[PDB]
Amino acid sequence: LHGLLLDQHEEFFIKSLKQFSLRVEILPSYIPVRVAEKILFVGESVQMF
Amino acid sequence: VLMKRSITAPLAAHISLVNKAAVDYFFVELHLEAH
Amino acid sequence: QEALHNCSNEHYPVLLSLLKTSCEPYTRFIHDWVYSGVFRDAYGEFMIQVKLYWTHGYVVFLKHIAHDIYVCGKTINLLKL
Amino acid sequence: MIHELLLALSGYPGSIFTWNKRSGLQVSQDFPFLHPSETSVLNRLCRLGTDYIRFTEFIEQYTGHVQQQQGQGGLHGIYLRAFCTGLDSV
């Protein structure tokens, strides 16, 4: 919704289109890749405008 | 999360009004643009 | 910074209730210089103080509104004249 | 033995349940009036209090003891803290 992140020294399966990325090891196996793409795009777009 | 989205909104909307009214007081009365 | 760093525990309403009244006098101070242009200080929690205009010094909240406050006070101090 | 069992299971080791970290809770079991029958039921009961001590010590040790002083996510961090918050209510 905004682009803010409040986790320090932790991750939330997401690390401008840079300094944030999806990686396979941090993502849960029961949360697929297809939803994580949409979450990533939505966050990047709201952060950009 | 803590952020201002209900407190700074009646203040930042007021700053522009102060600036605009003060510039308007300069223009039409002291006529800086004629100098 | 205790507000931003953790907001997902039992301490968050308690520390929010502490800070929410712990920032009330600072906001009460700022509500004078923006709405009457009267500056109040006896504590040194400001760098602002009251040449051809320059005796206004610059020798907390985010910096995104602070400089706007700094100019909106001087505008009223001109409008006092 | 009746009030003492509750005192031990609450997580405060008694004067008969000798606290150790290699046997946990354990009765003395050398009284001159010992019954063979009581031994097995006591040996079964000690383990749950031993586990309860470590659970409460873990939750106290890693939740609510820092004010943000690298960091680790299996000793600190918000996911372990959420784990402990669920743990105490279970």
Coordinates of N, CA, C and O in Angstrom, one line a residue, chain D residues 9 24 28 33 40 42 57 59 82:
Chain D
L9 N 5.5 -28.8 39.6 CA 5.0 -28.7 38.2 C 4.7 -27.3 37.8 O 4.6 -27.0 36.6
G24 N 17.1 -33.3 34.5 CA 15.8 -32.5 34.7 C 15.4 -32.5 36.1 O 16.1 -32.2 37.0
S28 N 14.8 -37.8 44.8 CA 15.9 -38.5 45.5 C 15.8 -40.0 45.4 O 16.8 -40.6 45.0
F33 N 11.7 -45.3 53.6 CA 10.3 -45.8 53.5 C 9.8 -45.9 52.1 O 8.6 -45.8 51.9
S40 N 7.7 -45.3 39.4 CA 7.4 -45.2 37.9 C 6.5 -44.0 37.6 O 6.7 -43.3 36.6
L42 N 6.2 -41.3 39.4 CA 7.0 -40.0 39.5 C 7.9 -39.8 38.3 O 8.1 -38.7 37.9
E57 N 11.4 -20.3 30.2 CA 12.7 -19.7 30.1 C 13.0 -19.1 28.7 O 13.6 -18.0 28.6
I59 N 10.8 -18.2 26.4 CA 9.9 -17.1 26.1 C 10.3 -15.9 26.8 O 10.3 -14.8 26.2
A82 N 6.9 -13.8 17.5 CA 5.6 -14.2 17.2 C 5.4 -15.7 17.6 O 4.4 -16.1 18.2

